[PDB]
Amino acid sequence: SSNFSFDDDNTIYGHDYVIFGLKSNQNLIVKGQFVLEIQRGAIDINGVIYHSGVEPMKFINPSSSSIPLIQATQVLNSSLLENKESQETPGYKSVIKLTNLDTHLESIGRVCPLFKNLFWQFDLDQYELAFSDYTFYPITKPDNTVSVIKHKNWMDVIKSLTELYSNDQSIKVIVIGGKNSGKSTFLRLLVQHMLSPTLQQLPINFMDLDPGQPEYSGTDCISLSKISEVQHGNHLSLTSTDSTQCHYVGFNSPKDQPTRYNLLVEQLVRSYESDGELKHESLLINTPGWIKGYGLELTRTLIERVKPTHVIYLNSGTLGVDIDIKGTNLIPLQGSFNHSGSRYSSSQLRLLKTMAYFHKIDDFKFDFQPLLFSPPIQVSYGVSTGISALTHLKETGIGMDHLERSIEATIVGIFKVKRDHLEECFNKGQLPLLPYKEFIKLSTEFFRLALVHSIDQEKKIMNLYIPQFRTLDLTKEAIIMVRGNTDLPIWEIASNEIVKRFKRQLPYITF
Amino acid sequence: SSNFSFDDDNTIYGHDYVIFGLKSNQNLIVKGQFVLEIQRGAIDINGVIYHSGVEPMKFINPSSSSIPLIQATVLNSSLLENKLFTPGYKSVIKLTNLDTHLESIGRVCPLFKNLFWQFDLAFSDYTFYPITKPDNTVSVIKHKNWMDVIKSLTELYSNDQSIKVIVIGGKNSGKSTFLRLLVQHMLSPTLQQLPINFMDLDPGQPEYSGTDCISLSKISEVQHGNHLSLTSTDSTQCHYVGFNSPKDQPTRYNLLVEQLVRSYESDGEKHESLLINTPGWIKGYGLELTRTLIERVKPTHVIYLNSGGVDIDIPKGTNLIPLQGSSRYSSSQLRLLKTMAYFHKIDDFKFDFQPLLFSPPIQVSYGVSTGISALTHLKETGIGMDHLERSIEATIVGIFKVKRDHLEECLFNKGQLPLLPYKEFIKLSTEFFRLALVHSIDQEKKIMNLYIPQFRTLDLTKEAIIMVRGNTDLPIWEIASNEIVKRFKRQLPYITFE
Amino acid sequence: HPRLTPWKSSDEVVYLKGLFFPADREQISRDELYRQYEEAISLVEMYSSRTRVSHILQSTAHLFSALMMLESFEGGLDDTVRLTASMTIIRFVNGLLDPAKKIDLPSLFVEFRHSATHDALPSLEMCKTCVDRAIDWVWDHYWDGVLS
Amino acid sequence: PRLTPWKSSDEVVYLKGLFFPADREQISRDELYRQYEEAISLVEMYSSRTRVSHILQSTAHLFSALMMLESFEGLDDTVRLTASMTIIRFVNGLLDPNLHLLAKKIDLPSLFVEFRHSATHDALPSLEMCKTCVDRAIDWVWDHYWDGV
């Protein structure tokens, strides 16, 4: 039953922003979407010091994850703080102001009735006076929301590693842990700590080799991302965080295509050594949810592949025997604790991370009306330059009449193959079906994931629902298509707003 | 702590035979091998009564099995003429030494010496030893349910005409003791004397059948001890399954059981009563085998030796009996003894257990010649042609007999030993002859050397003997008995030191 | 409330019913029957590519491939076919029992699992019997129920 | 005096030479599988004569799985199933001597225990994972049994 100091802080409601004046002991746990600057003093958020001068920060803390503490305890000790006062300031500690994000990502109740209250707009008679409804508001009364705070050893290891980033020498990091061990929270804390305003604004190099529970990466990618701006909440991989490339493994776990996974990881590590050698970018790695078995073998191969200079394990076990002690750290799991209803399952939240991918107009604009009403973005198929070939990543053996139906109403990754690399080698024909064996050898650049809708057979044209994308203008770079293992959420095939709209026998669903 | 009645100054010690005069309230358990004649009175053993008039009967009871009680409990009409200086008590049993040449297993085997009669108050040293003082040796004691259920079959055997009986149980359930009791009960000389028809469908732990036989045996005389399949009752044929269990070739086992039931129906539909043993399988595919058997035989009775069961209830009448049951010390290790003693018998009740090497071995030619026309491997038939010839060597193969027209068939490769395919093997009819232990094989001379226990020269006109390698294993004691590890320098023909 | 099925309009389960289990089981040619079997296995693979399929349908696809292998065996090294059929039975039975014989699973399958996993490898004939029993089981418990 | 299916112990050396000719580079890719076939035939012949130690029969099964997984180029489900069953039987027979400490004691690596569980209770392991596990176990038999003999 976590709670914060009730206010009662001479706060003014405003229209799109709320002004808070926090006392010395005052703290905030805020549920919802909000952007805040600091009008006076230096607010300390999750173990780093943010003064008034720092640029506004954008929060996407979800009910699934824990809420980062927003402390005002730290008295302003530096002149870097730039305080602008238009009200009252009054000499009462620090005053911070937070503005409505209006991300429109809260409007998920339209598709799913269980994903309500994940992003809150009060979804029941009012029990408090002067209540107002915004996209954000802190929980004044105690409630069952876990806050982001760990044992002093957890923050101590990260802080001790942090001043090692303060000086010239660069840091490469490994993080090892099982699913629900807390690797995501550890990485978000570490990236928040390395990009504090006190440290130089030098972008960290973040490598995420986890397809199942990815961070800073859309569903089913291996991704390297130079992070120049920290993501202050649990953005469900729903913020830009400019990245060099998002590598489509196509599978939830490493085991499905171990050779492609290893080749992709080694290529991404080589691309990181193209820039990590420059020593400005402190390379940082996430590892899959596998803690034992072939996952441990992959972790060891990575450790000998990337000169570690640091390794973190989240659970104590046979890792010390398996991994040579070469410096490694030991930190207990301290995994996030929340109810299954409040903290949706990883397989149940992958569906959100997949849906919001196609439903994003921009980085922070989210329109969650069913995709069907939008134009299908018709594309060609065959030897045509629009989209050339199909590659099934795992189930390679498929009837030449059956793959075309297979990709109908399923999530496929649109790749990019330049010049004659696509010409390296079936029947075109209804659909060429570039084989996976020739696919692995060819180098591919990953364009955004595609949702397929209503394959047309009489014409090669096939509809394709893809998120925000620039015009795919290529001189000869054919954008081939692949099918992985990535699942398709029901809500974008059949939600209430289109089932009630039609109510007839829909193609791919049963009642 | 089972014990037998001890008599002093009453029993007489004689040369080659001992006579006991048992009082009315006296019982005897005798370990060893002995021919049992009755001089005066009636001796009721193992729940059935035997009088003085009956011909002498020979006991082979080892330490592994329970000893059948020999009770003095009395009076019946004559018939039985009793026939010595003193009348003494009511009954006077006469035990005759049985020179069965057992106890010679100790020469080849160290632990098996204690099973049979061996010596290792004043008592002389014979092949029968009565356990006067109480010892750990068990005695045949069965529940009153065990007795009256098995006796209710005897009364229905007394009147016309025949009964078909099944016995179902696990490996340790005790089907062997039950089935021996039943044959002892019906073959007793107080009811109809016609020979029972016994069908033994268990290859792993068979009785009245050599190792790896499905055998329909018309039992005319009683095997009064737990004979280890050593003594033979006149049986129309063995059928060499070649495998310890029906799991290995369910189709061969099924086609063989079905073909044995044909002769059982031809000779039982002829007043003789049929009787069946079933494998130790009660779980899994064994229940299905038993159900298929019950449907075909349409048995008059069915007996199950445990509780569990619903599937068997349809549709033949089913009896439920508790398992009870019992040293060996292992039942699978007794299979090796039953395999070895088969090759070491000159004739029933005579077993010379010196290793088979020293005896003159037997020649055959593995070619088109009439010696042995073909060879077939059960189980793994994909054995390379060059490797089958060495595969058969130093194993106990089973030689068959086939008609010349059937003998023609397709053998596959003339070179070395011609393999006959298993697919052609199953289709054509075969008549089992004997189990063969192949000493060695001469590649250059094409004549291979084998040992078989006893044979009638296999005299026939173009009757191709076909060799068969099953799963049955060779007892180590035949290749590497301590006698032939010292009589020939310790080498590695097929054996290695630990 | 809505559920996702890989097959369009849910009439291709009727198609798999006729393609796995054709109307006539003996007048039909065995070569054409095996072509129908292979087509059904290809469709089950396609539905697996689309999404997760019910364990009964995946087991049917695996069991009919094992059946085609066993009945088309030409002899020789049977190590492969015995192993594959044993694994098919093990996956089928375990997937059934993963979520007493309350499911009406015969004891033959459970004995086969113990024989293959821990004991000696089951023989070719035993595998042929067990695969046919499994094919009958899935039909009786799932495939006969589904109609149009 | 235990019984051996091979006439002399020298045929165990010949069987190892067929499995592990030790001139792995460079020999013809179809000559290696010609040696492997002869060795698998010898293993099955020995098994037909008498019980063979689990490692030798397992090496035969794993080498059969290796040949099929290397020869494979279509419908991969049966090739998946064969190698899967080979690995499960190998691991189970190794462990069937009497749970995490047991694997360390027998020195079986963790990927095998995960492969057996994934094959028995989960979806079929990837053919690329089947190759990995088969090669790891074939290295295991070299590391434990075959090197000494």
Side-chain angles (χ1 to χ4, degrees), chain B residues 162 164 197 263 265-269 274:
Chain B
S162 67
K164 315 169 145 199
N197 197 356
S263 183
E265 287 205 331
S266 162
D267 283 346
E269 93 288 20
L274 187 152

Side-chain angles (χ1 to χ4, degrees), chain A residues 305-306 308 310-312 314-321 323-324:
Chain A
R305 180 42 182 99
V306 180
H310 268 89
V311 169
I312 295 89
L314 268 289
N315 295 353
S316 67
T318 60
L319 310 189
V321 180
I323 297 94
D324 171 58

Side-chain angles (χ1 to χ4, degrees), chain B residues 224-247 249-263 265-269 273-281:
Chain B
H224 268 292
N226 190 318
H227 293 83
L228 278 296
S229 293
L230 319 172
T231 60
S232 296
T233 63
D234 49 351
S235 66
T236 304
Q237 81 278 23
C238 175
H239 281 297
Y240 179 72
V241 176
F243 294 83
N244 187 305
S245 165
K247 65 178 72 66
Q249 288 183 355
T251 186
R252 172 78 190 298
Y253 180 82
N254 267 325
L255 182 163
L256 201 64
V257 166
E258 175 65 26
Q259 175 273 290
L260 197 73
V261 169
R262 293 296 179 185
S263 183
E265 287 205 331
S266 162
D267 283 346
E269 93 288 20
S273 72
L274 187 152
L275 172 53
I276 292 172
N277 195 338
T278 47
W281 272 5

Side-chain angles (χ1 to χ4, degrees), chain C residues 67-85:
Chain C
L67 175 69
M68 281 155 28
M69 181 166 58
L70 294 159
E71 298 187 346
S72 64
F73 199 61
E74 290 89 3
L77 287 170
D78 63 358
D79 275 18
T80 293
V81 176
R82 293 178 66 188
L83 288 169
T84 296

